[PDB]
C-alpha cells in the first residue's frame, strides 16, 4: 500500500516510560503509538475500522539531521560488542549492514552518530498531603529532550482513506501529545506527513530475510511457519489501561509479549490487533501488526 513518512518534531521533553515514571525512553513502540491513535480517534468521534483493519505502522524511530535511523537487524554478524551496543542504523547504511561491510569501528561510530536528544530526570513534589498536615512527596519524572534537528519518525501503510484518517489523527495528536506525562507538559509535538522517497526505495527491495519494523506478534497459525530460524527479542508489553470508561479504578492490562523491532524472520507474518483487556467495559487494543522491511543477508 502507500507508505507515508510521519516526522515528529517535539516542542517539549517527552516522558516515555518502560515500567516506571522515572524511566526516560527516547522512543515508543507501535503498540504505544497505535493506542494513542485509538484514543485520539475515539475522542474525535472517528471510526476505528481503518486503524484496526488496514493501518500498518512501525515503531517510532530516531531521526536527526541528514539521517533516518532504522532498528538494528537481529542478524548474525559473519569487536562484536560494537554491534551488541548498537541500536539504530541509518537508512543509507542499512543496506550495507545486512550484507556486512560494517566493522566494529564503523558500528561504534554509527551509535555515537545518533544525535537523538538527551535523557534526564526532573524531580517534583506533591503538596497534596502538605495541606492535610502531612509532608511533600518528592517524585521523579524521567523525560527525554530531543535536539533541535532531531525527533521521531514512523511510516504508515494503508489505503487512501486510512492514510487520510491518520493525517487527521496525527494533526489532533500534535496537541494531545504522546508520552506519559502529557497533561503535565511532557509530550507536545508537531508532525508532518509526507510521501517517503528514500523509504519507498528501501521497502521496494526484496531480499531473502524479512525485518520487523514494528513491535509485532504472530497469531497461533502464523507462529507455526514463521518461527523457524528466526532471530528476535520478546519484549514484555505491560502497563495500565488509560481510559475513563474501562473501569472505576485503573487496572493493568494482560501481559502481552511481542517481538521487538528489527527482529529478522525468514517467513513473513501478518500480526494482529490483540486484545489485552480483562472483562473491562471496552476492549483494550494492543497493536502487534507487522511492518516488514525485507533485506538481503
Amino acid at each position: 500500500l502507500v507508505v507515508k513518512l510521519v516526522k515528529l518534531t517535539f516542542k517539549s521533553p517527552v516522558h516515555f516510560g518502560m515500567k516506571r515514571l522515572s524511566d526516560s525512553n527516547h522512543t515508543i513502540a507501535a503498540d504505544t503509538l497505535f493506542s494513542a491513535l485509538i484514543i485520539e480517534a475515539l475522542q474525535q468521534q472517528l471510526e476505528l475500522s481503518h486503524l484496526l483493519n488496514n493501518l500498518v505502522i512501525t515503531d517510532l524511530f530516531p531521526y536527526n539531521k541528514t539521517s533516518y535511523f532504522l532498528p538494528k537487524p537481529l542478524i548474525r554478524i559473519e569487536g562484536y560488542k560494537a554491534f551488541k551496543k548498537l541500536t539504530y542504523i541509518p537508512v543509507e547504511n542499512y543496506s550495507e549492514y545486512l550484507r556486512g561491510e560494517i566493522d566494529s569501528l564503523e558500528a561504534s561510530k554509527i551509535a555515537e552518530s545518533l544525535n537523538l536528544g538527551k535523557a534526564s530526570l526532573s524531580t517534583k513534589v506533591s503538596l497534596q498531603a502538605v495541606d492535610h498536615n502531612g509532608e511533600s512527596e518528592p517524585y521523579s519524572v524521567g523525560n527525554f529532550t530531543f535536539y533541535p534537528e532531531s525527533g521521531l519518525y514512523f511510516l504508515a501503510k494503508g489505503n487512501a482513506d486510512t492514510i487520510g484518517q491518520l493525517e487527521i489523527l496525527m494533526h489532533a495528536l500534535q496537541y494531545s501529545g504522546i508520552g506519559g506525562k502529557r497533561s503535565a507538559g511532557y509530550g507536545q509535538f508537531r508532525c508532518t506527513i509526507e510521501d517517503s522517497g528514500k523509504f519507498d526505495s528501501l521497502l521496494s527491495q526484496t531480499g531473502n530475510i524479512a525485518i520487523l519494523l514494528s513491535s509485532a506478534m504472530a497469531s497461533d497459525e502464523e507462529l507455526v511457519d514463521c518461527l523457524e530460524d528466526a532471530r528476535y527479542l520478546l519484549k514484555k508489553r505491560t502497563g495500565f489501561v488509560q481510559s475513563k470508561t474501562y473501569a472505576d479504578q485503573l487496572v493493568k492490562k494482560k501481559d502481552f509479549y511481542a517481538f521487538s523491532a528489527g527482529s529478522t524472520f525468514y517467513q513473513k507474518f501478518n500480526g494482529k490487533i490483540f486484545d489485552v483487556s480483562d472483562n473491562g467495559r471496552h476492549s483494550v487494543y494492543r497493536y502487534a501488526k507487522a511492518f516488514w522491511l525485507e533485506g538481503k543477508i
Binding site: 517539549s12 535523557a119 503538596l127 503535565a184 479504578q249 485503573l250
Partner: protein, 198 residues
C-alpha cells in the same frame, strides 16, 4: 466534535523566579537539559494554578475536571495540558545584549532567634527581565463546560499573577505576569474569538 484550544503567550517574570531541582550551584533552578536555559515546568504551573483554584473554589469537581483526576469511580482526563514554559528566544537575545546572565544568585541569611547570628544562604533565581513562552492546551470535552472552565482558568491565572510561582515567593520571589499572544482552536469546530484570559 472534540476540540482543543491552544493558549500561547508569555510569562514575564516580575521578580526573580526560583523553581528548584550545569555544575554545582547553591539551590539551582530547573533548566532544560539540552539548552541549559532556565524553564518553568508545566507541572509547576499546573500545580500552582490547581492550588490557587482549589483555595478559590473551597476535591472539587471543577478542579478535578480541569487539572485531571485519578480517584476511584471518577477518573477525569485533564483538560489543561500546560506545557513547559521555555526561555523565549526574544528574552535570550535581549539578555545577550547587556551580557546579562539568564539567572542571578540572590544572597540572604537567617539571623537566629537564640544567638542573633546570620547564617547565609544562596538561591539561584531567574532574572527579572526573563520571559517564558507558555503553551496551554484546553481539551473541550464538554461544549457546555468550556465557558465555566475558562472562567476558572482566568480566575486561577489572576490569582497566580497576584501570587508567586515556584520558590520562596512569600519572601519576594516567583512573581509573574501572564500575557496572552493568541487563543486559537487548533483542533475542532469550537470557536475561541469570544474566549479570553485575563
Amino acid at each position: 466534535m472534540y476540540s482543543k484550544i491552544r493558549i500561547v503567550g508569555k510569562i514575564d517574570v516580575l521578580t526573580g523566579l526560583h523553581i528548584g531541582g550545569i555544575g554545582a550551584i547553591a539551590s539551582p533552578v530547573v533548566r532544560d537539559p539540552y539548552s541549559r536555559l532556565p524553564i518553568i515546568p508545566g507541572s509547576s504551573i499546573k500545580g500552582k494554578m490547581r492550588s490557587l483554584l482549589a483555595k478559590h473554589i473551597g476535591d472539587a469537581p471543577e478542579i478535578l475536571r480541569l487539572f485531571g483526576s485519578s480517584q476511584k469511580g471518577a477518573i477525569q482526563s485533564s483538560r489543561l495540558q500546560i506545557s513547559d514554559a521555555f526561555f523565549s528566544k526574544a528574552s535570550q537575545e535581549e539578555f545577550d545584549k547587556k551580557d546579562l546572565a539568564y539567572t542571578e544568585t540572590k544572597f540572604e541569611n537567617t539571623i537566629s532567634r537564640l544567638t542573633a547570628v546570620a547564617n547565609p544562604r544562596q538561591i539561584e533565581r531567574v532574572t527579572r527581565g526573563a520571559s517564558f513562552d507558555f503553551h496551554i492546551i484546553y481539551n473541550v470535552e464538554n461544549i457546555n463546560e468550556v465557558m465555566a472552565d475558562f472562567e476558572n482558568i482566568k480566575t486561577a491565572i489572576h490569582l497566580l499573577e497576584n501570587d508567586y510561582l515556584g520558590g520562596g515567593g512569600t519572601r519576594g520571589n516567583g512573581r509573574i505576569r501572564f500575557v496572552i499572544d493568541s487563543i486559537d482552536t487548533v483542533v475542532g469546530d469550537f470557536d475561541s474569538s469570544n474566549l479570553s484570559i485575563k
